[PDB]
Each structure stands twice: as structure tokens, then as C-alpha cells.
Amino acid sequence: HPEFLKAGKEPGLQIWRVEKFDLVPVPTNLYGDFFTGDAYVILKTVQLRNGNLQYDLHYWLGNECSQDESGAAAIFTVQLDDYLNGRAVQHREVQGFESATFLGYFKSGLKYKKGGVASGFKHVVVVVQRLFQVKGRRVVRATEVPVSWESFNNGDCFILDLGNNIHQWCGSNSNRYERLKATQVSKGIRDNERSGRARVHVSEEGTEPEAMLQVLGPKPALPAGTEDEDAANRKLAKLYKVSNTMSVSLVADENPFAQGALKSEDCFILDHGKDGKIFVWKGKQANTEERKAALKTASDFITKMDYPKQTQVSVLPEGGETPLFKQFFKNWRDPDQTDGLGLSYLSSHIANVERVPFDAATLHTSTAMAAQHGMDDDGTGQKQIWRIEGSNKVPVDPATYGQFYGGDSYIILYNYRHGGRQGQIIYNWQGAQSTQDEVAASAILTAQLDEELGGTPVQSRVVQGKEPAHLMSLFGGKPMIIYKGGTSREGGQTAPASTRLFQVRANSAGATRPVEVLPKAGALNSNDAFVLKTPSAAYLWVGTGASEAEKTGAQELLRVLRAQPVQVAEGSEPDGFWEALGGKAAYRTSPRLKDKKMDAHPPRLFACSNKIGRFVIEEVPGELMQEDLATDDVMLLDTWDQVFVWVGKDSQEEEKTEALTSAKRYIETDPANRDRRTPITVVKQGFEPPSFVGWFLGWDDDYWSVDPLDRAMAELA
Known part of the structure; x- marks a missing residue:
């Protein structure tokens, strides 16, 4: 065997040019140059946190490349994969429409050279x-x-x-x-x-x-x-099942799909063609002929639907599915999850990110810890709380700091200190049952306050039920109690419900928030404790996954409810528990992805724009770098738990004021059916918070002191 032996042995990037049905290595100093008349084969091997090797097989087709040359590159991609035991993710990239993963491998960009082996041109x-x-x-x-x-x-x-x-x-x-x-x-x-x-x-x-x-x-x-x-053709995708000839059968009309729809005896096509990409998913039990013919059928399906020939196609094995493919499904959860160090796949663009666990004693020195946990600091700075009453902000009684009512909307001006420098955060919390005028009034006043404080403070729009982890930690040790829907104004306090149900859940910081939910058994969760204040006895339901912080929050939330607790562990519930909730029901038991959320939903940076109302988002590939934040753009950093909106200093004012809606649009169109209560965080250039900059290794605090262009052409050019 030839070049096959010198393949996925060490982490790195390997490029071969398919030359007369032979894999000829491209000189490494030329990685990035590609002849339009040829086909190439690209192997990227990534080291997993447990030391295992993960392979990504790409083959690249130039614009003026033959059919028997794309076949040659395809045959190699097939036979290279099964030399690596069929665990690689295969990519077919066409010139000018390559995948983001492929584009990430090349920093200085691509060069498309005129010529090819047929034209009589080598690389050396x-x-x-x-x-x-x-x-x-x-x-x-x-x-x-x-x-x-x-x-x-x-x-x-x-x-x-x-x-x-x-x-x-x-x-x-x-x-x-x-x-x-x-x-x-x-x-x-x-x-x-x-x-x-x-x-x-x-x-x-x-x-x-x-x-x-x-x-x-x-x-x-x-x-x-x-x-x-x-654009907006992002939301809708369909799932198909392949037979061989070649016919497909619609198995899922709309996303999110059921993960069980994928059966391991067959192969499936995830059609996202209107957005320019389709997936092929190989079941482990699928016929060997069917597996090797994945690219065979994928190209057919492209032509049988009249998709552009240059449509991105990627091929995934069962168990090594990429996180985007998984996000097309309703809560994809793997048969390992908690056990292990990673998941099905590790996005290369975060593969070199050192994972920092939480420890609040040294939060103030690690931007990386701040970003990886949404924790700008410990939550112990000066703050003001305002309730929105009509058209004005009203100071909230300091005794009730930590309690929020679903019929109100609040503004929380918070002073954060991290490292040596400070910043400010304005949290806009809008209750679910808050009347629309006051919710809108809270947004107007949130922006007005930002301008009063110089336009520097961070703005964060929070919705009842989905609060950022940092927000819970603002109240010292007491939990952040969220009521289903009442008022805190002076002439308006409502009556407490008969039986109420509270979901008390803690963040990585140990702070907790009891969320008042519907009084049904289907609202329970094995990872958190619960509080059920019925007029008879107050229940302290503790899940198997619940820990000390959740018990402490549930206990001390029962404190403010002036009710003696009744300790009840999950599985051993007295009779009165279930009947007070309306009977037994099926609730969520699968653990959450605490420290593996990054592996499941790695942060992605996007560039948003709307020229004619047409919303245009483009993903910037590769490692997240400060250089990728253009001063005249409005960028999106999606961390799953949160969507940052980076506003460039020199962007247009229209795009600046649309920062909230452009983010809201990106979340709305996300094919993963992302929650719309997902918090949005607007951030100004040069005033970014730690939870933002910590995602960018090599962040120069005074990077914009000299114009980026005035530095480059004065550097080495």
C-alpha cells in the first residue's frame, strides 16, 4: 500500500491531488492552491479529548474537472474511509461552494489556479x-x-x-x-x-x-x-429513506425529526437542499453495497430533485453524526452522553479549546471560564432593579431582590468587575403574562438607559422561564424565585394559587432559580428538585439527579412560602403527591449535557445583514478570532444558551437598531427549532463582556487602537 499508510496517523491536515487515478501529495507549503481542472482528496484528523483520532474526508472538484476525475477522487474517498474502519465523515466540496468545515482548514484562503493534469501542469x-x-x-x-x-x-x-x-x-x-x-x-x-x-x-x-x-x-x-x-430557506428540511437503481421514500415531512426515524439497517437522506446541503446517514447494519454507494445515491438524489450540482453533500456514520445533523432532530441524546469525555463528533473549530471547569474564586482572571459558563463574574456587584409600571421605571423594594412576577417586566442595571476593568449589564426581563405595552415599554427604557450610560453597557433581553446563568447569581445566596404571573406594584398584588409547582434548578455557579410551572406531573425533572405547596402539605420532591444546591434552593424557597417541607425522594412518592398533581405521568428523566453542551452545540460566529429585508447570514469558518469581527458589520455569536449580537463601531445605524430583531430572526429561522425565549445579548465593539471575549483565544484588549488595515499593509506587506 502507498500513501494510504501515511494517512490518519497524527493530528493535522493532509492533501493529495488525484493524478491519473493516483494520490499524489500536494507540497504542504502550497496547501490552499487548487487546480480548477483537477480533483483533490483532503484528510483532516483531529485529536479527541480522550486521545482518539477523528477523521474528516473531503474531496474537492474544480470547475473544469472531468467526470472520470471526480469519480477517481470519489473512489479514493470511499476506499480511504473503509481503510479508517468506516468512521470518517465524508465531504464532497465543489469549487466556490465548499463546506464551512473545509473552509476552516485554510487561513489565508483558497487560490483557484488555471490548469490541470490534462492541461499539463504540476504543483511542484x-x-x-x-x-x-x-x-x-x-x-x-x-x-x-x-x-x-x-x-x-x-x-x-x-x-x-x-x-x-x-x-x-x-x-x-x-x-x-x-x-x-x-x-x-x-x-x-x-x-x-x-x-x-x-x-x-x-x-x-x-x-x-x-x-x-x-x-x-x-x-x-x-x-x-x-x-x-x-437567507430564510433555513427552517424547513425533510428526511428520506433510501432503497438502492435508486428510489427514496419520505419518512419525515417536517423538522425537527424523531431520532428513532433513523434505523440502523438502512441509510437515510436529510434533505436541506433549498439551503444548499444534504446529508447521507449510514446505519451500521446497512448493506455494505449500500454504504459504499452513499455518494452514488447522494448525487442521484441531487439530480432527481433538480438541486444545483454544486450542492454540499456530507456522509455520516451511525454514532459519528455531526452536531448540525443532530440538531435537525427533536432532542438528540446519545447512548453515552454523561459517560465519556465527548460526543459523536468534535467540531474542529473548537477542538483546540482548553476546557475550564467552574471555580468562582478565580472567575475574575479567566475570560475562558467566563465564556464557557455565561458567567461575567460571581454576581456580587452593585445593582438596581426597576419594575416597569406604565411608562416609567420604578425602583423595586430591596427586600424582594430576587423575586420576579410574571405579570411585570423588569430592568436590572448591574455593575460587573472582571480582571482589572469593569463594565455594565442591563438585563431586560419580560414576564410571560406581562401586558404588551409594558413589555414593549421595558424594551424602550432598556435602550434609553444604555444611551444614558454612554452606549457602553451590555444589553440582554431575557424572557420568563429561560434566564441566563449569570442572572441567577445576582442576589447573593438566595434563589431567584420566578412566579407564574402576578404583579409587584402597590395596588395590584394578586391571590396565590391553590396548589402551585416550582422547578428549582441550579446553574454551574451553585445559584438556583425556582420556576413556578403548571401543576402537572409531566412538568417534573429527574435532574432538579421541585416544590409543591398544596394547601394540605408542602412537598420537597428531590430528583435522583438533584444535588445540594437544588435541595438548598427548594428548602429556602419553601422558607419564603411559610410552609413546612415534606421531604420526598424521586421514586418513593407518597400517595397524596400524585393526586395533588392530577395523577402519575411521564416526565423528563434523561440527564442534561452540563459540560458537554459545547460538544453538542459549539459556538458559531455569523455575519447578519438585511439589504432589502432579505435576511442574509453567513457563517465565518474556523477558529473564532477577533480578526473576524469587522468594524462595519453586526455579527452573531451563538453559544446555544444565548445569542450575542456584536455591533461594529462603523456599521450602519439601521443595522445597529435592528440588532435585537436580526438576532430574533436568526433564532426564528434556525432549522433546529430553537426556543424563541432564548436570551439575546447585544454588545458594543470595544466594550465586550468576558462571557463574549473568552470564546476568542488571542484577544487583544487594545486591538482597535490601530486600524486593522493600516497595520497589515504596514506590517509585512
Whole structure:
């Protein structure tokens, strides 16, 4: 055996060019260059936290690549996978529409070279005279184009490669951010292709150097940019079951699908084609012919539905499904979950993130711990609570700090200290039964308060029932009691219900919040304790998964209810318990993914926009980096438990005021059917909280002191 032996042995990236049905290694210093007339095979191996190796097999098809060449690359992807015991995730990437995972492997971006093995061009390779058109802001792509002014336009940047002189040219209508990412490609040509020997010359229209003007002739009038992502065709997806010939059978009309719909004896197609990707899921018991023919059937299904030929397709084995595939299902939970160190798959873009458990004594020094637990600090800073009464904020009685009523909406101005510096957080808590005028009034006043405090404070819109972990910790040691629906104003206190049911649950911080729920048995949960104040006896129901903090919260919540507790463990409930709840019922028993939520729902950064009301979101691939936050964009950092809205200083005011709704739109369209009470957190550039910056390793506190572009072209360019 040849190159197969030197494969997934160590963590890293391996690229081969399929050359005459042979896997020829691409020189590593050229990783990122791809000939449009050829096909490549790419293996990314990632080390899991337990030391095991996880494989991602990609094969890449250029625009001018033959059919017998894509087949060759496909055969290798198949036979490489079963050499790795059929546990790899396979990807078919087409030029210009590659998967985010594939795009993450390449920092400096991609280069699409004219030529191929048929044209008689190798990779190894002096005298150079080529031209690249650099289009891209988050996925910088450099396409080789004819060496002519006709190839140009004033919207993008261009690189005139003259061997020992690289000439970067940028149009007048080109944005400063695009110019920045273009210098990366130019620098990459200098350092990787010429080994740092050549000189990179930067210019814009009107300042063309004589060398460039000698090659292209005098500059004529140039046009403008064609300006190229995900829209609202994200929500709907369908699941199919394959037979062989090739026929499919609809098994699930709408997502979220039932995880049990996947049977291990067959293979299934998750159709997300209107969003540009489809999945193939191999059951472990599926026929060997069926498994090896996954890409076979996937391409057929593409044509039988009239999807674009360039549709992303990925192939998953049972047990190694990616988290996006799992999110298409209603509460996907694995047959290991709690036991182990990870899950089905570890997203490469967070594979190098050190996992920091919680310890409040040193929260104030670790941005990473702050981000991984949604904990800006310990919750012990100065704060003000206001209840919204009509059109004004009313100070809440300090004795009742920690109790919130479902018929009110509150504003919580909190002072946080982390590291050496401070910040402020404005929490906007809107009750479920709060009247619409006052809920809307709470939002108006929340924004007004932010401007009073200089526009610097963080804004967080919370909805009753789904409160961030940090919010629970603001009240010292007492729990955050949330009532189903009453008022706290002076002439309006309602009457307590006959029998009430409280779900007391703790965060990673040990703070707890008892949530008053419906008085039904189906509302119970094995991981938390519960409090049932019936007029007869007050029950303290403690689940098998409940710990000290939940008992302490449930106990001390029964304190404020002036009722003696009746300790009752799960499974051994007295008679009166079930009948007070309306009888026995099926509740949730499966444990939660406490520290493995990151593995299940890794944080993703997005760029949101709405040009003509059309909501456009584009995922930025790879490791989360401060460099990826453009000053003229409104970005989205989705941590599952929360959706941050990073607002760039130089973005348009329209997009700035729409920060709340753009996030609300992204959550609404999420194919995972994400809860709409999910807290949204608006954050200003240069005033980001620790729970945000801790996700970005290598965060320069004074990164924006010098303009990013003014630094790059002054650095090594």
C-alpha cells in the first residue's frame, strides 16, 4: 500500500491531488492552491479529548474537472474511509461552494489556479505572470483570471503575480476589510510560494506602478462589483429513506425529526437542499453495497430533485453524526452522553479549546471560564432593579431582590468587575403574562438607559422561564424565585394559587432559580428538585439527579412560602403527591449535557445583514478570532444558551437598531427549532463582556487602537 499508510496517523491536515487515478501529495507549503481542472482528496484528523483520532474526508472538484476525475477522487474517498474502519465523515466540496468545515482548514484562503493534469501542469514547479481576482470577506477566495484590464473591476482587489514582485491592486469601491483579507493572500504568495523572497507592492486605482502598467497597458474605465449565503430557506428540511437503481421514500415531512426515524439497517437522506446541503446517514447494519454507494445515491438524489450540482453533500456514520445533523432532530441524546469525555463528533473549530471547569474564586482572571459558563463574574456587584409600571421605571423594594412576577417586566442595571476593568449589564426581563405595552415599554427604557450610560453597557433581553446563568447569581445566596404571573406594584398584588409547582434548578455557579410551572406531573425533572405547596402539605420532591444546591434552593424557597417541607425522594412518592398533581405521568428523566453542551452545540460566529429585508447570514469558518469581527458589520455569536449580537463601531445605524430583531430572526429561522425565549445579548465593539471575549483565544484588549488595515499593509506587506 502507498500513501494510504501515511494517512490518519497524527493530528493535522493532509492533501493529495488525484493524478491519473493516483494520490499524489500536494507540497504542504502550497496547501490552499487548487487546480480548477483537477480533483483533490483532503484528510483532516483531529485529536479527541480522550486521545482518539477523528477523521474528516473531503474531496474537492474544480470547475473544469472531468467526470472520470471526480469519480477517481470519489473512489479514493470511499476506499480511504473503509481503510479508517468506516468512521470518517465524508465531504464532497465543489469549487466556490465548499463546506464551512473545509473552509476552516485554510487561513489565508483558497487560490483557484488555471490548469490541470490534462492541461499539463504540476504543483511542484521562477518566471511568473498570473493574475488573481480576490473576492471574499469571510471566505477569501482568489481566482486566477486572464492577465488583462478586462479582468478587473473597481469592487474587488487583484494580485498581479510577477514572481519576485507581487502586486496587490485594490479598487476604489473596495471596502477596507476586503483589502485586509486580500493582503493575506498576497503575503501568503510571498511567504509560501516564494519563501519570503519576493516583495509585495500594494496600490490602488490611480497609483499603479510602472511594472504593472507595462504588463497590462494603460488603465481604462473599469466597472463595479458583482457582489457575489443563507437567507430564510433555513427552517424547513425533510428526511428520506433510501432503497438502492435508486428510489427514496419520505419518512419525515417536517423538522425537527424523531431520532428513532433513523434505523440502523438502512441509510437515510436529510434533505436541506433549498439551503444548499444534504446529508447521507449510514446505519451500521446497512448493506455494505449500500454504504459504499452513499455518494452514488447522494448525487442521484441531487439530480432527481433538480438541486444545483454544486450542492454540499456530507456522509455520516451511525454514532459519528455531526452536531448540525443532530440538531435537525427533536432532542438528540446519545447512548453515552454523561459517560465519556465527548460526543459523536468534535467540531474542529473548537477542538483546540482548553476546557475550564467552574471555580468562582478565580472567575475574575479567566475570560475562558467566563465564556464557557455565561458567567461575567460571581454576581456580587452593585445593582438596581426597576419594575416597569406604565411608562416609567420604578425602583423595586430591596427586600424582594430576587423575586420576579410574571405579570411585570423588569430592568436590572448591574455593575460587573472582571480582571482589572469593569463594565455594565442591563438585563431586560419580560414576564410571560406581562401586558404588551409594558413589555414593549421595558424594551424602550432598556435602550434609553444604555444611551444614558454612554452606549457602553451590555444589553440582554431575557424572557420568563429561560434566564441566563449569570442572572441567577445576582442576589447573593438566595434563589431567584420566578412566579407564574402576578404583579409587584402597590395596588395590584394578586391571590396565590391553590396548589402551585416550582422547578428549582441550579446553574454551574451553585445559584438556583425556582420556576413556578403548571401543576402537572409531566412538568417534573429527574435532574432538579421541585416544590409543591398544596394547601394540605408542602412537598420537597428531590430528583435522583438533584444535588445540594437544588435541595438548598427548594428548602429556602419553601422558607419564603411559610410552609413546612415534606421531604420526598424521586421514586418513593407518597400517595397524596400524585393526586395533588392530577395523577402519575411521564416526565423528563434523561440527564442534561452540563459540560458537554459545547460538544453538542459549539459556538458559531455569523455575519447578519438585511439589504432589502432579505435576511442574509453567513457563517465565518474556523477558529473564532477577533480578526473576524469587522468594524462595519453586526455579527452573531451563538453559544446555544444565548445569542450575542456584536455591533461594529462603523456599521450602519439601521443595522445597529435592528440588532435585537436580526438576532430574533436568526433564532426564528434556525432549522433546529430553537426556543424563541432564548436570551439575546447585544454588545458594543470595544466594550465586550468576558462571557463574549473568552470564546476568542488571542484577544487583544487594545486591538482597535490601530486600524486593522493600516497595520497589515504596514506590517509585512
